[PDB]
Every structure is written in structure tokens, then in C-alpha cells.
Amino acid sequence: TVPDRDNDGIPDSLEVEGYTVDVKNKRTFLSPWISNIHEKKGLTKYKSSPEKWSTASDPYSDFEKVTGRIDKNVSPEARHPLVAAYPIVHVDMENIILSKNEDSQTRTISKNTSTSRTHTSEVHGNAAGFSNSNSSTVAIDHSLSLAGERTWAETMGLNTADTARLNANIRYVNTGTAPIYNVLPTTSLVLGKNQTLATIKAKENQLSQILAPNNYYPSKNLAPIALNAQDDFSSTPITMNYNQFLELEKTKQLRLDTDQVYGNIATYNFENGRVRVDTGSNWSEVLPQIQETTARIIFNGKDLNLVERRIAAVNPSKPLETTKPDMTLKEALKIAFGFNEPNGNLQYQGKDITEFDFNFDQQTSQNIKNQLAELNATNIYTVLDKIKLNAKMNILIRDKRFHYDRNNIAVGADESVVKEAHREVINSSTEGLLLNIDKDIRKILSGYIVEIEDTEGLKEVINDRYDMLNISSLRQDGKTFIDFKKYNDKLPLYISNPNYKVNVYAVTKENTIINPSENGDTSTNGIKKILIFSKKGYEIG
Amino acid sequence: TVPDRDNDGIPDSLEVEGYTVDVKNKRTFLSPWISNIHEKKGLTKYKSSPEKWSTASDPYSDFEKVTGRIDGNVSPEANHPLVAAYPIVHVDMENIILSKNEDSQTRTISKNTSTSRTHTSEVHGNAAGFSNSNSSTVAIDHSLSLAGERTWAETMGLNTADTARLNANIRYVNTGTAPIYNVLPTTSLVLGKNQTLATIKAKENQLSQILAPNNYYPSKNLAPIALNAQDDFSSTPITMNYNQFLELEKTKQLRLDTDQVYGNIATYNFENGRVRVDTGSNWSEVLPQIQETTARIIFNGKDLNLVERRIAAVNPSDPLETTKPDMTLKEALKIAFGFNEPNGNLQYQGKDITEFDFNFDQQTSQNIKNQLAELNATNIYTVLDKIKLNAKMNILIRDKRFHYDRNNIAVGADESVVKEAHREVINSSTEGLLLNIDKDIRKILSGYIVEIEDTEGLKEVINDRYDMLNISSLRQDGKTFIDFKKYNDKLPLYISNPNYKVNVYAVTKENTIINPSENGDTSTNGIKKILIFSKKGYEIG
Ligand SMILES: [Ca+2]
Ligand SMILES: [Ca+2]
Ligand SMILES: [Ca+2]
Ligand SMILES: [Ca+2]
DSSP, rough: OOOOSOSSSHHHHHHHOOOOEOOOOOOOOEEOOOHHHHHHTTOOBBBBTOSSSSSSSSSSHHHHHHHHHHHSSSSSSGGTTTOOOOOEEEEEEEEEEEEEEOOSSSOOOOEEEEEEEEEOOOSSOOOOOOOEEEEEOOOOOOOOOOOTTOOHHHHHHTTOOOOEEEEEEEEEEOOSSOOOOOOOOEEEETTTEEEEEEEEEOOTTTTOOOTTTTTSSSSSTTTEEETTTTTTTTTEEEEEEEEHHHHHHOOOOOEEEEEEOOOOOOEOOOOTTTEEEEEOOOOOGTHHHHSSSSSSOOOOOOSSSSEEHHHHBBBBTTGGGGGOOOBBHHHEEEEEEETTTTTSEEETTTEEGGEEEEEOOHHHHHHEEEEEEHTTTSSSTTSSSTOOOOOOOOEEEESEEEEETTTTOOEOOOOHHHHHOOOOOEEEEEEEEEEOOTTTTTGGGEEEEEEOOOSSSSOBBTTTTTTTOOOEEETTEEEEEESGGGTTTTTTOOOOOTTTTEEEEEETTTTTOOSOSSSOOOOTOOOOHHHHHOOBSSTOO | OOOOOSSSSOOOOHHHOOOOEEEEESSSSEEEEEHHEOOOOOOOOOOTTOOSSTOOOOSSSSHHHEEEOOOOOOOOOGGGTBBBBOOEEEEEEEEEEEEEEOOTTSEEEEEEOOEOOOOOOOOSSSSOOOOEEEEEEEEEEOOOOSOOOOOHHHHTTTTOOEEEEEEEEEEEEEESSSSOOOOOOEEEEEEETTTTEEEOOOOOOOOOOOOOEEEEEEEETTTOOTOEEEEEEEEOEEEEHHHHHHHHHHHOOEEEEEEEHHHHHHEOOOOTTEEEEEOOOOOHHHHHHHHSEEEEEEEEESSSSEEEEEEEOOTTOOSSSSOOOOOOOHHHHHHHHBBBBBSSEETTTTTGGGGGEEEOOOOHHHHHHHHHHTTTOTTTTTTTTTOOOBTTTTTEEEEEEEEEOTTOOOEEEEEHHHHHHTEEEEESSSSEEEEEOOOGGGEEEEEEEEEEEEESSSESSSOOSSSSSEEEEOOOSOOOOESGGTTTOOOOOOOOOOEEEEEEEEEEEETHHHHHSSSOOOTTTTTOOOEEEEEEETOOO
């Protein structure tokens, strides 16, 4: 006869005042939080809403989340009652291949790509800020693989009356916290600004495979999915005219907008413990309610990729959402991403919180500036355990070192960081070098520039082209390999004197050029470089 | 037990004499209005009718509305029992392209448009005004984009025996208070008076996406819907013969009549709280009942766009509609739109109520003139808390400063406020002008006319063309930019004497012309202008 308004299984007083789940001899017990006998064993103090069946409005209950009777692919950070469990799938593009529409063996362009999940922010000054849909922008390689390939349009033989067809290899990736079971979304390939070339639509129930969190659908040891290469019934290619081809060759960038139609939800069944796809549940019934009653936080501290989580905060207008527990910013960071306090300081695996850069949108900036004024403080890193969150807040934590473009991708840091990151030299040789460059710093480097300094000092650039900076490689053990052999007619570096200096430069992605310049510049004159490597000729060998 | 006739969950005496929903320890509590302890916390005193399950006849209950057990996309002012929740969706047209029906790279004409929701009233005196329909008019840009493009019919190269095709990019927009979930409406494109060119019937349930209030269906970071472009199952073009092309070039105006077929309603499910689209409920059942038992009020204070809200008022001939609470005009403005009285004066974000203009239909003007007669007063702005509202009224609150056309769109103000709007100069030069013009004032300006004055005084107009007035540009920092270089062959203002005077004119949207006059008049001779700018040539540098 205890009260239970929401029918999840936990009585109301437990959900308000704190509860925990403990395993005795082998059985599980759900008991209230008694501080002296529970903190010792290392248990977690849960708090929930006594009037919602799921506090984060996702399809898994509070009981099912804390007690483990859940579909086991739900990510471990989403087993808290206040972290939402929902999938976020986008499309990753491996490589494209461009042919002319009908001896065509050396008349195709086959390039590698690079796809990243984007979070487009406010434009600076001459064009709720952060919007909720899955989109990724690819970046086609501008370097050369064939020794004498040039001039894409004349490489193929494209004229103004001709059309060009496109083909590519894609694979999906779920970076959220819940699995997708049968249906895959319908992404669309936008070129330029609004010019949709095609809508990539997978066949319905052509799979029965699960798409678990942090996993790819054609797995990394299988073959990718090719756009419209199957032909047969779908012999409809992806056609571009001449103007669109010129726009693609100028910009060298596409965009893949993915929608949010997923399948059904697989639910635990209390009789025999079987997880089975429920045709009564659906993700489209849940995703708006997740998006309206939770606070979004985006973070890239594990690697330079954006990771989105949502945390169930209050909304002071509705009385049903004033029932959820109070959520400070510190606790949200601790339960959602994995920060900790080893000695008092909130850090993320060594990196302190003061090395990250808080960026809100408009409404959140107003909302937090009011709290900072009423708390009488100016440093947000001091009062991080008093900033209350509310619903529809958008926060964006990012690393302070690098510089980010309009889509919040790291495109190149300060020069002092790049110089510091190249201080570990393992092997020096006439053919190449070996360094221990960090994984984070090596994301933002577009390429390298090699030139020879005389004893007096001169400048002769071996790879003196915009599309010849691709020399660097990486052995899997953890050691990169720069290569002078690649653009020196497969002959080693011409050490004319042992008292010379071999100057190597680095260029970040915000400074590189991907096209020929205005008049004729296929040279590295107008490219900003950073001094990286300058040693004598007799310390090389 | 307590009496509860309507069977929603609130007892009768509470609904008649006032109630509110308080949150104690963490649980919610529906209580009568205790004036001592509910006024301090800032709660709202609700009132409803004890015999209607939904007082504003919309498909959400009174209980569901006050307690927060509602769809979270329902607009926040429609959380009151006395404000109806229903969608008002129309079509926004972005840009059109016109070409001849079949080398067509310069045989086309591409223009940007401007779409606004209309509220067509009666003609002045020489032909009850307000009716229930969603329609918007577009305004194709009459000015030029290239250097010397002219003469639309000769630009496309048409004769009397030619037909032209039409293609455009549209976007739906929901400005009501409730969302649509699967179905999109079926608009029709009307040229002139009744010449329907085509009916847009974008296929239902090829989407599953939501059209939330104050949001667009292909969202602003996606690509728009193209009219009849892809041809997948659309083998018919949008044809237009020569006569209709002549009227289109004469008018440069269309019309988009959108009907009211929407999908189903998503309702709260009390066992697990899942908001799920119910196949039983439907908006077609609800919308006439909303339209017969409420009193609409149209307002354009936030910007110069019309916003329609409906407030549940009594109807004295009906015994079930004498159950609803008494609604005054002040309370309707306070709960529907967001007016407040800080000191005792009803004002909408600083602007006092006396800055707005009241307009009724015939029946409402009779009904309100009788109330002013029996109240013994002549000023409606003084007795605004004693004007009772009844059902089927129609009020139109609009801004006093402007002048409105047939569709109640702001098309011009008086001269004095236009001169006052341009007295903030950020930077002045011979290249352009930097100003802070207010965003509402700059919505009624069609373009500018620039000219140079002699030291004795002469009249030399630089851009002396009707299609060469678009010399204003707006940057995202919030500051406009006039530009002399646009029609001076990319060359700055040729000042001949530093003691000259520069004169810039402004032409509003009611005074501009879209077609040259009867003989050949591409001149700006008979165009009513306004003195904006008069400095010297030695002060702009
Ligand atoms: Ca409970
Ligand atoms: Ca609960
Ligand atoms: Ca009742
Ligand atoms: Ca009622």
C-alpha cells in the first residue's frame, strides 16, 4: 500500500529522497540510501522523478535502468535515470569514384575522403543557434596518386554538353546510446548549398542486423555499401552537369543530411527475460519528447570528434517537469561523460576542466549570466557546482588549444603547440624521418613542405606544388614516417654537403589550398608554413 | 465523492472558483487558490468550465493542460485552459525560375521572392471581412541582378504562340500553437484572380517528420522542397501560356491558397507517459468546434507579421457556453500574447497599449459600441478591463505608425518616422553608409535613390532606373550598408567639388513601381521620395 504514481516499480519516497541497488549473496536488493553503510561499499545514490515512468523520457524505465533488466546494448553511461538513451546515426563516406556518362580505364578519378559529424554554429558577422539533425560533410582528397595526373576535367575529358556520374562507398555509424534494429535512415547528398544530387535510400528490411552504439553497419572487416553500383532495378545513377562538376571541383566538399526514422524498440520481457523487438513501440514517438525535456552537452575531449549526450533537467513552466531532481553542471559532466574528482579538481583523465572552453547559445548565455550575477562571481570554473541546468539548454565544451571552423571541426592550433609536438625524433635518415607525434595534433596537419638550406642558406622546395604535400605516413606501432622518396624520382635526398640544413615545414588545414590559385600558382609561395625540423646534415646519415 | 460532471479530473468547485497546480516536496498537487501561499511563489490562477472536458474545444483536456501531461511541442501559451491549441500552416515561397517550354542557360530568369501571410479585409468604399483560411501572397523581385538584363518576355524569347514553365522552391511554416505529424496540406497556386496554375500535393507518408510551431518543414539548415523538379512520379510540368505570362509580368504577384487537412493528434497515454499519434483523433473533427466557440484576435507587435490566437469566450444564447469563465479584453491580451502591466499600464515589451489600433468586423463593432454606451465611456483604452468578450468575435490589433494595404501588410509609414529612423551613422564614406536602422522600419522600404547636388544646387541622379534601387545590404552584425558602387560601373562616387552636397532618397513599398510606364519611362521622375541624407562632400571623405 505504498504510493506509486508512475507505475515503474520504485515507491515515491525512494525516488525523491535517494535509493540504490545492491547485490547481496547473489540476489539484488533495491533499498533507500543510508549514508554510513552505503558510501563505504562504493554505491551510487540515484534520484528520480516520482511521477514520470521514465525521467529522461526514453523508452526504458527507471527501474529497468538501475536494476539491469534492460536491453544489454544500451551504453553504460545511459543506465542512470537522468541520462537519455537514444540513437544518433550518421553516414561515413569512404571513397568516391567519378566517371563520365556514356576505353575509359584512365578516365576516372578515384580519391579518398574524410567524413566528420558536424555541429554548425552561429556565423560571425556578415551572413536557437544549434539545431538538431544528423549531418556530416565529406572532404575529397586534393593530392595526387598518379605521377602525372592533372586537371580533373581534362583528366576525364568533360565538355559543356556532357554529364558526369558519381559513385561512392558509404557506411553508417551509431554514435548514440541505444541500438537500431531493422531500419536504416534515408540520407540525402547535398552539394553546394541546396543542390541535392540524390537521396540514398537503403532497401527496406534488406537487413536484420543490429546497429549497436559505437559500431558501423558494414563492419570494419567487411565490404562497404556502394551507392547505385548494384544497377539492375535501381540503374538510376547520380548525375551532375558541367556547372555542378565545376562547383564540386572548386569546393571539393559534399554534405550528407540524415533524417531520424529508425525502427522499433527492443524491450525486456519479465517472464522469460527475452529482449524482443516490440511493434507497439517506435523511436519517432520518443525522440521529440527527449528533445524537449532535456539539456544537450557536446564534448570532444576523448578525441577530436563531437559527442552528444542529453541530461534530464527541470523546466520551471510545466509542473510535471518540476518533479525531476536538481541537476548542476558538475554532476551532469560527472555522470554523462566520465569526469572525476581525484583530489578536488574536476578532470577528464588528467586534463583539468580549465583546459576546456564553454560555449553556450543565446538563451543559455542569458540564463547562465543571470545565475552568475546572482551568485556574485565571474569565473565559471569556480562555481561549476552551483550552475543549475534547465530544459532546452545547449552547451558546447571543446578543447582550448586548437582553432575551430564554422562546423566546429579542429583545423589547426597555435604554432607553439605544433613545435612542441615535434620534439620527439626517433630516426633520421636520407630517405625519411620517424617521429612520435601525438594523435590529436596529427588530425589538424594537412601536409608537409621539404626544402634544403645551404651553409649560406638557400631555398629549393622539392615538392613545390599545392597538390604535392602528401608525403607523410604512419606505421601502426605508433611512429609516423615522413618521406622524401615520394617526390624525388624514387631517388634519395641529394645531400650536397654535410654542413647543410634540411628544412621541413608543416601546414595546417586552415592554411592549405585545394585549388590552383588565380593566375598560375601551382607553387607553395602563398602557403603559410611553420618551422618544424632544422638540423645539420651530419646528424642524419 | 466529489462532483465532477465533465469527467476530466478537476472537481467542479475548483474549476469555478479558481485552482492552481503546486509542486510540494517533489510531487505535484492540484489545489484551490489559497491567496496567501500561492501568490508568493508566482503561480497562475486558473478557471475553466465544469461541464466541458476541454474548455477551448481543442483536443487536450483541462487537466492535461494545467498539469503538464501534454505533448511538449504544444506552444507555451496554449497550456492555459482558455487558449485553443491548433495549427495554422501556410506556404513560404523562396525563389522561382522561369523558362520556355522546349541551350537554356541564358534563356531562363531566376528571381527571389517574398512571402507573407495575409488577412484580406473589405475594399474601402467602391467595390464581414474576416474569414477562416490560410493564404499568402508572394512578391517576385522587380529589380535586376546582372548588368543590363531587361524585358522579361524578350529575355526568355517568347512569341504569342509560346508556353512557359514554372519551377520554384517552397517551404511550409506552422505559426499556430499545435504540431502536425504526418500529413501536409494541399495548397494551390493562383495567378491573377482565379487562374489556378497548379495544385501542390506533396505525397503524404513519404515523410514521417514533424512540423512544430514556429518552425519550417524542410528546416533552415536543409534544402527546400522543389516544385515539380525531380519528376519522379510527376510527368506534368507547370505550364503557362503567353497571356498568363503577360499578366504575371504586369503584376509580379501570385497567391497560395492552403486548405486545412491535417493529420492526427498525438495524445498522452497515462500508463507509461508515451505521447503517441492516435488514429482515432483527427483535426478535422476538432477545427469547426474551435472556430465556433472562441474569439480570434490578430496581432503584429512582435514583427510586422500577423499572429492569430483564439481565446475561449462565453456565448449567451447557449447554455453550455454560459459555463465558461468571464473573459475581459485585458485578460485575453495578457494570457494569449504576453502583455503585462508593470506599473498599472498594459504594455507589450515597452510599447504601451495606446500605440496600437483596434479594428473589428460589423458584429463585434456593434457588440462593443453597445458595451461602451452602457458603460458610459468613450475611450476604449481606459475601460479595457471591462470589455467582455463573447464567442465569434474578431478583433485586429495593429501598429499605429504604418499604413496597411488590402492584406493588412505594412507597406509604408509617414515621413516623420522615416526621417527619424535614419539619424544614427556608424561610418560615412564615398563607398557607402553604415547605419543602425530598426528592423521593422526597414521592412517597408523598397529601395533607395541616390543623387549628387551642386554647391549652388543641381539634380543628378546616379541610378535613375526603377529597377536600380536595391542598393541596401544588411550584414549579420545588425548594421545596414548603402552602396554607391552598384550602378556606377564598380567605381566610387565621383565628387567634383568637396563643397558639394549628397542627397539620398527613400521609396516605400506603396510608392514603388514594378513596370515601366506607358511610353518608355524607366525614369525616377514621378516617384514620391523622402529626404534621408544631406551632408557635404568634405565630410564623407
Ligand atoms: Ca515510482
Ligand atoms: Ca519514476
Ligand atoms: Ca471537471
Ligand atoms: Ca473542465
